[PDB]
């Protein structure tokens, strides 16, 4: 279900923020062809006039001097009789693109951002645990943007998410630990999240500056702004944050190996604009972040495949140590536990089943022996909540929620099967998961929950997810029975 | 310990840079105790009669006006007459330590180096390998220094090192490709770099400025210099660089996992200071080279794995289902090799050899498993030289120069064994490795090796040396037959 959330086009809404001034030109003439109706405060005169007209008799010559510079970095700092404003300059159906926004005025802003990341690099960070590392990754970015409240999101494979870390200030509430739908941050803003990975929201109380002509002519729609830094957001998007007392905001992607991992969501409780070249500093380190994760990530599972390798080798050298396949599997009962971390094991060696550690009862281990046997899979079964797929023992979670099984043989059923009780989690729900939004009457005009206060849920049945190294000692063990 | 360029005391060698000022102050008093003999450049009178002179008679009032700033960080700006300098405080021997140094002039320093932090922290970057991760690196400290020519340094197993990345400007002679003696960089010096990992030299050619007095009263030595700024390398180094047409040096440890990695070092053919903030920015970009490079190594080496496992996977999914171990080893010989990267495997099940692929011959075989009985290894042995340790088949460098063996059984002789031929490497050297000092007659008088000209050589009985995967799937087959 693709819902209506996932529909409208959060790219062709068609307004700027009023913070801002943006121009489009089309031709060899530059001729301005879509202006937001701001204009005027900047160029000087009616939007509606300037239509029509070459770059040249509507850009002050304070900017077109250094429109080279624009055109091969993208951006230029630029005086104006207004102030200082960065021209920022893009492509977009066919046009050329022109933002200006105020610029940085605060000239020790890059000294202290590259302290910011030495903190976040340091001799080396993750001490004590990535957890502080999202904390001072946290931390370094609200001492730079200012913001009252700076959280890390998280997204699990059903793109739900959790705030994982919270920098905020003293005297505010705050999300720590929270957990929040898939349908608060939607598919299509999502697929352009991990494509542009900046956005500010100055002022979520402003109404949106509308552009002119309302469509490019040319196409019969509204230009597209997915790589503009003003395009104004979904309207239904400033009324969750009205919702939450919040004034403005501000999120940056967390692309680390390729995908939408997180984001880190800036609070604050009034209007504020971000430079954006304060807003490239913090882009630096959140990619900064991003690799730490990675690193300490691959590093953990490293040393957690070695240990799990000292398990292999203690397991043949004790199995060549003497003849006893039912003994030593029995008097080294705990390395094969611990082999996935689990807790019983029933072996499939013909004859009858070698049952170690706590294991569902033998006539019941003969019931998934036979049903597993007509599964799909080659040579490995993980279930974290089998009762689901297999009812029959939906009443033996205290022993078999979930499952970890390995075909010893090709043909001819011969298994072994690692089983996991079940972990009981309370998470804590920002407000009711089953109620996330409003419909009006019509099911036609969505709004957002106006409560994020607490809902618990102790969640049951399931296990502990089967990492990647159970999985691999699993097959591991496989090459020494056959 | 082991030669004459390993005693010099290289942090006891009381004399500092002609582009700086040093004073050390003690007690409560804040007296005056050591201090450089150039002090009266910037303080105006002479640098004797203001010892043991409190630290407010002595100092100039520009620098005191800061003097709460300059203690509780360690670095500040000030502005003498004499121009803007940077004050930078630490204890060494009892003693409050304050080093004065010309700072720095262009204020879009933090703005550049933003840019260049930018570069080396983006995702794909190693995407056409770890030596344009090293190639990015070389170039952008270049950006930022503006050095003729900035080199990395990578030391082996041996404390040798070679230049596997360089950047430099036209027309200019490079070092890529080549190798330095350990000699070159000696251990007690390795030691400090492990501590202190930015050093400066504006001038090969300048002439030490001695420290006034030439000792600590309450010592009998002069002052340590370890955490200094200030301090003027061994003159045995001087000579090297202006043997070599260095004018001024700048060098950075890569320390990675918290063991020296490496070096970039820079070179310039003039005099040329450095301020102290760009090499902090510099030094950035040195510890994110080694996360980049740290992250990178750690996906290969689990790449590796996965296509081992996957080795071991299919030859268990050939076991179990095809006859005795002598022939599903037949039809899968070209698995059990691949598993080590060899040339040749001999296994021995307690029947005769049964030799697959490019061997020894069953008596060289035979001889060498009774030789490695002896040996104490516990469940695996591997060398890259196996005619250094056993000679028999020291001739048989092209099929056995390095091998890599497993122990198939407990207080037995059951083992297979890898084999690998010799790889001729050729290690062009900058100079004859034989003569990398040239001693006067006596030899308390080194001097450094005059020439820098590629030396040729070749290096044979040497094979490719038995990495963490191969070995890691040795121990892997090790647990799969009886
Ligand atoms: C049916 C529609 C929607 C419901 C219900 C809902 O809750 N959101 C719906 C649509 C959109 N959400 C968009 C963006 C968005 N959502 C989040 C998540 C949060 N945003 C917040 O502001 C907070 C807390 C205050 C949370 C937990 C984020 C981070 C974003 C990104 C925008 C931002 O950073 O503020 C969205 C797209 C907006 C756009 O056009 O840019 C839509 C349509
Ligand atoms: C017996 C004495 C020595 C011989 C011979 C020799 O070759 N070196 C000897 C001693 C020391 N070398 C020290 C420092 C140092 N050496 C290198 C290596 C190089 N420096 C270069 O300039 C080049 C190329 C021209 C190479 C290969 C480096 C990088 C360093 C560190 C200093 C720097 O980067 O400029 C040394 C330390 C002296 C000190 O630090 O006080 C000694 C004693």
Redesign the interface.
Known sequence: DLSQCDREPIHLLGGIQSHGVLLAFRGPDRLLEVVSANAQALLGRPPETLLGQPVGRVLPAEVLAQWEPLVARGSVRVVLPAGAYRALLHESDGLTVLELEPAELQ?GM??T??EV??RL????AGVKGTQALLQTAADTVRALTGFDRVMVYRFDADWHGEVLAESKRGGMDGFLGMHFPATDIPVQARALYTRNPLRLIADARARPVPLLPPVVPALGRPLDLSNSALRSVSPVHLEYLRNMGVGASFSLSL?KEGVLWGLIACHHLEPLHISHERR??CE?LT??L???L??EE??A??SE?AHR?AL??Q???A???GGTLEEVLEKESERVLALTGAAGVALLLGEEPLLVGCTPAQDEVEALVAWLATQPFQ?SFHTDRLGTVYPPLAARADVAAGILAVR???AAARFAIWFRPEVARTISWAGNPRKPAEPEPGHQRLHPRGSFQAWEETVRDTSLPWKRADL?AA??F???L?
Chains 1, 2 share one sequence.
């Open positions: 000239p890059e000294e951002a590259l990341v030495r690099v340091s001799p080396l692309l490239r500093a630096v990619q900064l991003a690799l730490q990675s690193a691959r590093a599972e490293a495949d390798a292999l080798g397991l043949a050298t199995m060549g140590e040579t010893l043989a090709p691999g097959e591991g496989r090459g020494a056959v």
